[PDB]
Structure 1
Amino acid sequence: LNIGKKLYEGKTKEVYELLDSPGKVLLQSKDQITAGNAARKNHLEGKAAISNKITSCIFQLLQEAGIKTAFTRKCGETAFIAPQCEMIPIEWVCRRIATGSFLKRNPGVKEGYKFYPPKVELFFKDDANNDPQWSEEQLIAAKFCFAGLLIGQTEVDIMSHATQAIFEILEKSWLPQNCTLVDMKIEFGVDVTTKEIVLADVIDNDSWRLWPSGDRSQQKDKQSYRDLKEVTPEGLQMVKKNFEWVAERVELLLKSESQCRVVVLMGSTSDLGHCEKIKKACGNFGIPCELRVTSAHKGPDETLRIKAEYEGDGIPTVFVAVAGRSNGLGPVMSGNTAYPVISCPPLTPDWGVQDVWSSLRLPSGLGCSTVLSPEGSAQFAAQIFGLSNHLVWSKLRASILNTWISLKQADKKIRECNL
């Protein structure tokens, strides 16, 4: 592990070059806590390890969801390796609940006002003037350029949208711990190699407000330190316990709270290719997916026996019925299970206009849905599992963001042919 020159030095972390690794850096956390732009600063033993653990869990969580993030791997108790970025000097805040500086800048608004959707604000990084709020108009007018990327309307719109998606994913991920994510701050950078804007710096207990059971008086974040009238060593021990409480629970955000399974039932092996597309698409959402062959018309006894094997082992299941021509498979399955059934018929333009009505017009007492896209049927099945599984939900949420970013990037490209 061949460390090079000190590239940047902050109040709680240092970034070093790696002579062994082109375009990667090491972020070393420090045993230091700070607040405000006066002399609130303190040595706190174990803080480097707590900070590094939290940002390492959180970045792994966001990266595995599909959020583009400056994170390679954890690297000992107190550092992590990241792709080298040029930092954008903006603090991006997202709020679910109005507290803190939102109340100061908006007198009359009360503690607890809820933002639907979550509110995004920008602060320019400058300690000298205590990080003043900026409009999007101010950020665009600054004509910032980092690793050769000019930060214009498109880039500002992307960091704004991503800030909201990242908040939403962290908010959903803390929920199973009975913790309310109130707000957070993040920073983005331009990856010097890819030129992509990515989540960067760190996310740790300085980055957010976390209320157990949504109770402010139980705050576990750095606000406990900000709020001390006087820093005593008894005060610093409470703040340390709060950091430890977060650190003891953060790894559980990477844990699945619910098992998920899709079972694709096909009436014929000639539909196998259509079924492989559903299975592959389920893999993108981290949902195990099984293929089976059964015909409602030639083997209805066996259809019900197979159904029962999946009903009976306790694993929450979505069935996808793939039957061409007169689809009896979705209907018979739909009528005989309390679990959801999705018909995804392998329609073609020859007879598809005729065949689809066998999936759509069903007798009463049948919940059976229809999704024509095979990738769509997996996505629908993911949306069902996302109601009870934060990891699936997070991949769906990040996927909304990434698709939207792709449109922005494609419109930016085509906009050039208009000059």
Structure 2
Amino acid sequence: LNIGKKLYEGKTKEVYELLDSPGKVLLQSKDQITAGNAARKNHLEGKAAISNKITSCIFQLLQEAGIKTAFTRKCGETAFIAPQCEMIPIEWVCRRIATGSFLKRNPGVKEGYKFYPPKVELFFKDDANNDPQWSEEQLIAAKFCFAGLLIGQTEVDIMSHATQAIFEILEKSWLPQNCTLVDMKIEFGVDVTTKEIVLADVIDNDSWRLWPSGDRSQQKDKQSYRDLKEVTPEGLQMVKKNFEWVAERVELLLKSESQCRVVVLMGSTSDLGHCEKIKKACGNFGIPCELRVTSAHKGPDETLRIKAEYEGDGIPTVFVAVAGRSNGLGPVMSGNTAYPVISCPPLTPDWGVQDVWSSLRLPSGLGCSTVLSPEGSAQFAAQIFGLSNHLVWSKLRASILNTWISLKQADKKIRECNL
């Protein structure tokens, strides 16, 4: 591994140029912990490895959800390879529960106040002035330029929405450990290669506030260090065990907590092209999806036997019924299974106006729903698994973000058609 020159040395991490790989970069964590611009610089054994481990688990989690992130891979216990970024010197803060600074900047508001939606706040990176809060108006007006991307209305709006989505995803991801994610800081930079704005720096035990069972007294984050009346050698052991607790538990944010399956039933082999598209779309959400051929009209006894195969192996399953014309497959399925059924009929414009009403009007005692879009029927099935699988949810949540960013970009481009 071909180390280059030191591009930045921070209190807890160094960034190197990678001579062997053009426009990539190595972030080395150090065995260092700190509190503000105070005198807490304190060497801590194994901290480097814990910090690197967390940012790698989080960045991979966020990346596999579809958040645009500056991360390629881990490089040993204490560093990682990422595309080179020109950092935007703004600390972006998201908070579900008012605490810390929000109390001092909003006297009257009590510890525990809930923000719906999660609150976003901007802080300019200055220690000489102790990180002062900025309005979106201040950042737009500062006309900052980084790797030749001017930070204007569109880029600030995008980072703001992204901070919220990133927080929501990490919050959702920690929930199955009965851990309340209270708040967090992230930094965005510009990928010098692509010129995309991407999550950068790190996200580790310094970056957030983590309360098991929502109990502040069991705080596992760096707050435990910042709170110590006086830092003793014995006092740093508690702090380290808190860090160890997280590092051992973060690897389970990447673990699926629920099995998900779609079963597409098609009435005819000539529907296969339509069903391929559903399988593909389920693919994009990381949901196993099986195709099967059965007719309620010509083989209803097997429609029930096939139903039973997937009903009875204990795996949580959504059925998607693909039948054109008189869709008798959706009704029979809906009426004889406790698991959800989505009719997704392969309507063409010729008889689509007439055949949709075979899917929509069923005698009650049937909860059969309708979704025309084949990618839609996957996405809906995902939304359903999203209630019980944080990985599926995170993919859906990020999808919303990126679809919104996509419109912001399209609008900026075509806005120039008016100048």
TM-score, normalisation: structure 2: 1.00
Alpha-carbon separation, structure 1, partners of 2:9 and 2:273: 54
The Cα of 1:267 is off from its aligned counterpart by 0.2
What is the match of residue 373 of structure 2? 373
After TM superposition, where is structure 1 displaced by more than 2 Å over at least 4 residues in a row? Answer: none
Deviation, 1:39, is 1.1
Deviations 1:322-358 (A, max 9, x none): 0000000000000000000000000011000000000
| Matches of 1:304 and 1:189, distance apart in 2 | 55
3-state SS of paired residue (1:173): helix
RMSD: 0.4
For residues 91-137 of structure 1, give each alpha carbon's deviation from its aligned partner in whole angstroms, at most 9, with x where no partner exists.
Answer: 00000000000000000000000000000000000110000000000
Q: Distance in 1 between matches of 2:382 and 2:21?
A: 38
Aligned counterparts of 2:51 and 2:40: Cα–Cα separation in 1 = 18
Tell me the distance in 1 between the aligned counterparts of 2:67 and 2:36. 30
1:78: Cα distance to partner? 0.2
What's the secondary structure of 2:206's corresponding residue? coil
Shift of 1:38: 2.2
Q: Give per-residue Cα distances to partners, 1:285-343, cap 9 Å, x unaligned.
A: 00000000000000000100000000011110000000000000000000000000000
User: Equivalents in 1 of 2:186, 2:226: separation in Å?
Assistant: 18
Alpha-carbon distance between aligned partners in 1 of 2:249 and 2:49, rounded to the nearest angstrom: 14
Distance in 1 (alpha carbons) for counterparts of 2:61 and 2:239: 25
- The DSSP-based 3-state class of the residue aligned with 1:233 is coil
Q: Residue 248 of structure 1: CA displacement?
A: 0.9
Deviations 1:36-56 (A, max 9, x none): 112121000000000000000
Residues 5-60 of structure 1: per-residue CA shift (max 9 Å, x gap): 00001010000000100011000000000011121210000000000000000000
SS at match of 2:412: helix
2: CA distance, partners of 1:23 / 1:273: 42
Deviations 1:214-270 (A, max 9, x none): 000000000001101101111111110100000110000000000000000000011
Once the two structures are overlaid, the 10-residue window that deviates more, 233-242 or 389-398, is 233-242
Query: Bigger shift: 205-214 or 227-236?
Result: 227-236
Distance 2:40 2:47 in 1: 16
State the secondary structure of the residue aligned to 2:34.
Answer: strand
Separation in structure 2 between the aligned mates of residue 141 and residue 19 of structure 1, nearest angstrom: 37
Q: Percent identity?
A: 100
1:178 offset after TM fit, Å? Answer: 0.6
CA distance in 2, matches of 1:168, 1:91: 17
Q: Distance in 2 between matches of 1:166 and 1:396?
A: 12
Q: Matched residues in 1 for 2:285 and 2:32: separation?
A: 39
Question: Residue 240 of structure 1: SS of its match in structure 2?
Answer: helix
> Within 2, Cα distance between the matches of 1:55 and 1:336?
47
1:326 aligned residue: 326
Q: Deviations for 1:398-419, whole angstroms, at most 9, x for unmatched residues?
A: 0000000000000000100010
The count of corresponding residues between Structure 1 and Structure 2 is 419
CA deviation vs aligned residue, 1:144-195 (integer Å, no higher than 9, x gap)? 0000000000000000000000000000000000100000000000000000
- Alpha-carbon separation, structure 1, partners of 2:132 and 2:418: 37
Q: Residue by residue, what CA displacement relative to the aligned partner does 1:371-411 show, whole Å, maximum 9, x if unpaired?
A: 00000000000000000000000000000000000000000
SS of the residue aligned with 1:401?
helix
Determine the structure 2 residue equivalent to 1:158.
158
Which whole-Å CA distance do the structure 2 matches of 1:37 and 1:384 have between them? 47
CA distance in 2, matches of 1:416, 1:22: 33
Distance 2:295 2:363 in 1: 20
- Deviation track 1:67-108 (CA, whole Å, cap 9, x = no partner) reads 000000000000000000000000000000000000000000
**1: CA distance between counterparts of 2:402 and 2:207?**
23
Q: What SS class does the counterpart of residue 26 from structure 2 fall into?
A: strand
Structure 2 equivalent of residue 95 of structure 1? 95
Cα distance between partner residues in 2 of 1:274 and 1:346: 7
Whole-angstrom CA distance in 1 between matches of 2:286 and 2:410: 28
SS of equivalent to 1:290: strand
Secondary structure, counterpart of 1:89 in structure 2:
strand
State the secondary structure of the residue aligned to 1:254: coil
CA–CA distance in structure 2, aligned partners of residues 142 and 81 of structure 1: 31
Q: Distance in 2 between matches of 1:147 and 1:42?
A: 35
Which residue is equivalent to 1:313? Answer: 313
In structure 1, C-alpha distance between the alignment counterparts of 2:302 and 2:339, rounded to whole Å? 18
Q: 3-state SS of the aligned residue for 1:111?
A: coil
Structure 2 unaligned residues grouped into runs of 5+: none
Alpha-carbon separation, structure 2, partners of 1:206 and 1:3: 27
Aligned counterpart, 1:400: 400
Mapped partners of 1:32, 1:91: distance in 2:
20
C-alpha distance in 1 between matches for 2:352 and 2:248? 55
The CA distance in 2 between the partners of 1:235 and 1:160, in whole Å, is 37
Partner Cα separation in structure 1 for residue 164 and residue 343 of structure 2? 34
Partners of 2:260 and 2:234 in 1: how far apart? 46
Q: Indicate the SS of the match to 2:80.
A: strand
Which SS does the other structure have where 1:319 is aligned?
A: strand
What's the secondary structure of 2:253's corresponding residue?
Answer: helix
Partner Cα separation in structure 2 for residue 73 and residue 312 of structure 1? 40
Give the aligned partner of residue 54 of structure 1. 54
1:347 is aligned to 2:356: no
CA–CA distance in structure 2, aligned partners of residues 36 and 155 of structure 1: 28
